[PDB]
Amino acid sequence: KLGIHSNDTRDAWVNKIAQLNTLEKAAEMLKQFRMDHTTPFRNSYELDNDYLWIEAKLEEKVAVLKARAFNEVDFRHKTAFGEDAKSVLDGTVAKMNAAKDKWEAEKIHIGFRQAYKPPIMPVNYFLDGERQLGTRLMELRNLNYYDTPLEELRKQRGVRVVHLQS
């Protein structure tokens, strides 16, 4: 079974997810998953064709568990890990505002997503963060966007140039 929308990989993860019966274990698995399989900093590209769908299934379980474990105030203001969402948001924005350059900035933003994307952090705080973090990231990145030659930009990004043609 190797399909696009249905396959053994997806089936396997649905089973593993079905075994996440407590919030803390489920939330930790979701965060680990994001570190292992999302963004260009992912630890591995092995689940490239299915991670988006599997992540969504993992999110579903963490959400249902959180709504059952958290009282109303905490569901609105705490992260699945028990952190005060406002504190995390403000602290991350502070780091972003102190970022010395676009390289530091991109790591702060990308890392924030991997660690706090809903249902970890309440949507209201998470998107407020997207609003503020993205603004600084773009400001830093779009300043003198074309000054660095491609030859040097490739080195800054740290890619391995495999083949060039022209």
């Binding site: 190797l2 991109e106 609003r131 993205g134």
Partner: protein
């Protein structure tokens, strides 16, 4: 005094700017480097009720023509086969552009702080909903009354099988809504609509009428009447941010990136649909392009905004340099991969080859011969056991997918651009076809992680992908896509299975 009196839209609009009020958190919810001026005004003085009336009038004329005279004239049938197929792509692909423009303008409405500028964007939010339904209606009408309903009837799901769809989502979906609201406005309004869609829509009606299609002109001409408002919105976006220090720093960079994004896909795709998807020609794409991009937009339109700091895109020259053969280079790929579409394609006939050679000297010696050979190999016949993709494999002509634009390219065969950049980064290979898209990825890697068809289909047999993604006709065996537009000898799923074509990721060859 009891004289019959009333109140119109302008009379109410006079006080609309005052509707917004101040409070600490009254600010946009989206990330942006720019600041839209609080006093920005709008060109048209509309209110909800009047907007609805003016669109309602247009609808009545449009649907009246479609349901009465055009149906009585059998207008859905008396269209050239090639064009009936072209409209499956043209109408459904534009539909997604219209659709995402709804969300894009919802985002701009949120960005604007002046009640009048919000209102201008609002009218476009509604117009884009209308346009989505209009494009949907074209496919709906051709499916209901046309010569070949397949594709017209399920493009929303069958478009996911092919590679051409991926690029459309970049320029007409994600490019419209993902990023700085201003960057999106540039892709959508300042570049997308002003440079391409506005002229495109009208051109489509010309090509349509020439090939017997009076359905598309009826709808698209009606769509076009709403564009003035959208152009004003785009121009107004620039005015609203012109007096902010950020504008001098970032505007031209976002504009240049938007221009390249839009041009990268439309330069080759539009010309391809027009020239190859038609029987009767209206005008060579080359001259249509130069007038649109260079003269009208890159000259007249772009010039008017010079006073606001706007400048001609720095990649404009490269764009023109790569433009000439672009669409010709792409049709070779689209036809080679014909089994992955939701429409039927045809090889250029003798009469068409002459036209191509006449308007593009050197066409025959390159593309002409190739098509003649594929014809000889029996690419149109189900019993040949041949698909042009095999020819690319036999002649070591790998086809790559640009990581940023999603536009397919074969650098070893193209007469246009032939550059290829391959990088490895954190365990993944990435292939780029130009220096502008490469910069985009190096600077913003996390923005471009789209998996290409080869990555997703790697190791999969062709017939299985088509079957899984429902690329079959109602009989459950004949393919929707075809290598010819005749009514007999249509390829079946079994004809494809027998080819035993198994996809592989071309980048894996690199060490």
């Amino acid at each position: 005094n009891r004289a019959p009196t009333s109140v119109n839209a302008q009379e109410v609009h006079r006080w609309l700017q005052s509707f917004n009020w101040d409070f600490k958190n009254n600010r946009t919810k989206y990330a942006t480097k720019y600041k839209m001026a609080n006093e920005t005004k709008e060109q048209f003085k509309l209110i909800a009720k009047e907007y609805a009336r003016m669109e309602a009038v247009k609808d009545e004329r449009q649907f009246g023509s479609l349901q009465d005279a055009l149906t009585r004239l059998n207008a859905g049938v008396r269209v050239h086969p090639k064009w009936n197929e072209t409209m499956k792509v043209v109408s459904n692909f534009l539909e997604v552009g219209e659709y995402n423009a709804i969300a894009a303008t919802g985002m701009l409405w949120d960005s604007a702080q002046a009640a009048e500028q919000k209102n201008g964007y609002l009218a476009q939010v509604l117009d884009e909903i209308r346009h989505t339904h209009q494009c949907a209606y074209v496919n709906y009408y051709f499916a209901k009354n046309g010569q070949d309903p397949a594709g017209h009837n399920d493009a929303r799901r069958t478009r996911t099988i092919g590679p051409l769809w991926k690029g459309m989502k970049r320029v007409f979906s994600d490019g419209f809504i993902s990023g700085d609201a201003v960057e999106c406005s540039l892709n959508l309004q300042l570049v997308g609509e002003a440079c391409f869609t506005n002229p495109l829509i009208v051109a489509v009606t010309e090509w349509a009428a020439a090939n017997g299609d009076e359905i598309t002109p009826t709808v698209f001409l009606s769509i076009e009447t709403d564009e003035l408002r959208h152009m004003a919105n785009g121009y107004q976006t620039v005015v609203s941010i012109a007096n902010d220090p950020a504008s001098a720093k970032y505007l031209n960079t976002d504009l240049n990136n938007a221009f390249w994004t839009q041009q990268k896909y439309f330069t080759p795709v539009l010309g391809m649909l027009f020239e190859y998807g038609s029987k009767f020609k209206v005008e060579p794409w080359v001259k249509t392009w130069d007038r649109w991009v260079y003269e009208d937009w890159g000259g007249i339109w772009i010039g008017r905004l010079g006073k606001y700091g706007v400048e001609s895109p720095r990649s404009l020259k490269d764009a023109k340099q790569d433009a000439y053969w672009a669409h010709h280079d792409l049709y070779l790929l689209a036809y080679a991969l014909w089994p992955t579409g939701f429409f039927r394609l045809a090889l250029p006939d003798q009469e068409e080859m002459e036209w191509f050679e006449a308007n593009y000297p050197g066409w025959y010696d390159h593309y002409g011969k190739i098509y003649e050979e594929w014809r000889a190999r029996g690419c149109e016949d189900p019993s040949s056991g041949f698909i042009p993709l095999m020819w690319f494999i036999e002649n070591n002509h790998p086809i790559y997918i640009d990581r940023v634009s999603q536009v397919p390219f074969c650098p070893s065969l193209a007469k246009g651009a032939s550059t290829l950049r391959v990088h490895e980064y954190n365990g993944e290979m990435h292939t780029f076809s130009d220096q502008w898209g490469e910069r985009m990825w190096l600077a913003e890697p996390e923005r471009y992680e789209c998996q290409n068809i080869f990555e997703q289909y790697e190791g999969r047999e062709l017939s299985e992908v088509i079957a899984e993604l429902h690329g079959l006709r109602s009989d459950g065996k004949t393919l929707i896509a075809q290598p010819h537009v005749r009514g007999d000898k249509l390829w079946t799923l079994d004809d494809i299975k027998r080819l035993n074509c198994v996809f592989k990721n071309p980048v894996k060859a690199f060490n």
